[PDB]
Design an enzyme around this catalytic site. Structure first.
Site, PDB file in Angstrom:
ATOM      1  N   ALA A   7       0.827  -1.263   0.242  1.00 58.62           N
ATOM      2  CA  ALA A   7      -0.055  -0.169   0.137  1.00 58.62           C
ATOM      3  C   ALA A   7       0.787   1.200   0.153  1.00 58.62           C
ATOM      4  O   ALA A   7       1.983   1.307   1.289  1.00 58.62           O
ATOM      5  CB  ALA A   7      -1.240   0.301   1.184  1.00 58.62           C
ATOM      6  N   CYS A   8       0.673   2.217  -0.948  1.00 56.91           N
ATOM      7  CA  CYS A   8       1.599   3.185  -1.461  1.00 56.91           C
ATOM      8  C   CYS A   8       1.629   3.881  -2.472  1.00 56.91           C
ATOM      9  O   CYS A   8       0.758   3.749  -2.955  1.00 56.91           O
ATOM     10  CB  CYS A   8       3.151   2.371  -1.585  1.00 56.91           C
ATOM     11  SG  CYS A   8       3.477   1.721  -3.550  1.00 56.91           S
ATOM     12  N   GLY A   9       1.739   5.474  -2.432  1.00 56.66           N
ATOM     13  CA  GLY A   9       0.907   5.924  -3.280  1.00 56.66           C
ATOM     14  C   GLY A   9       2.053   6.422  -4.853  1.00 56.66           C
ATOM     15  O   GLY A   9       2.094   7.398  -5.653  1.00 56.66           O
ATOM     16  N   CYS A  39      -2.015  -1.352  -3.927  1.00 58.11           N
ATOM     17  CA  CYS A  39      -2.610  -0.316  -4.683  1.00 58.11           C
ATOM     18  C   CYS A  39      -2.349   1.266  -2.911  1.00 58.11           C
ATOM     19  O   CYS A  39      -1.401   0.890  -2.349  1.00 58.11           O
ATOM     20  CB  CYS A  39      -4.672  -1.057  -3.948  1.00 58.11           C
ATOM     21  SG  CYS A  39      -4.833  -1.341  -2.041  1.00 58.11           S
TER      22      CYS A  39
END
Length: 93
Positions: A7-9, A39
């Site tokens: 989970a990372c941007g 995501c």
């Protein structure tokens, strides 16, 4: 078998690279059968409960605390293979 969520941007290429590096570290530990997904941190809030392991920036894992019963693993640097291996060992060994 083992489901892991990154989970990372980060952008698309970077996200794939982090998933791959996580997967490689899991295989070094002897974990053979792995399903890896990525995501955003905000998207992971709703999805993290589906996963055995959830990996995210150490600066943001507090956003995911309580969203899963799995291992929540925080990294200062998401691309650092050595921190990746260390944090997975610490969570699973």
């Amino acid at each position: 078998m083992v489901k892991v969520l990154t989970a990372c941007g980060n952008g698309m290429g970077s996200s794939m690279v982090i998933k791959m590096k996580v997967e490689n570290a899991l295989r070094q530990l002897g974990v053979s059968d792995i399903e890896s997904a990525s995501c955003s941190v905000g998207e992971a809030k709703g999805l993290a409960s589906n996963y055995d392991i959830v990996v995210a920036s150490n600066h943001l894992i507090h956003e995911l605390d309580g969203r899963t019963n799995g291992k929540l693993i925080g990294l200062d640097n998401l691309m650092d293979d050595n921190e990746i291996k260390t944090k997975l060992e610490e969570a699973l060994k």
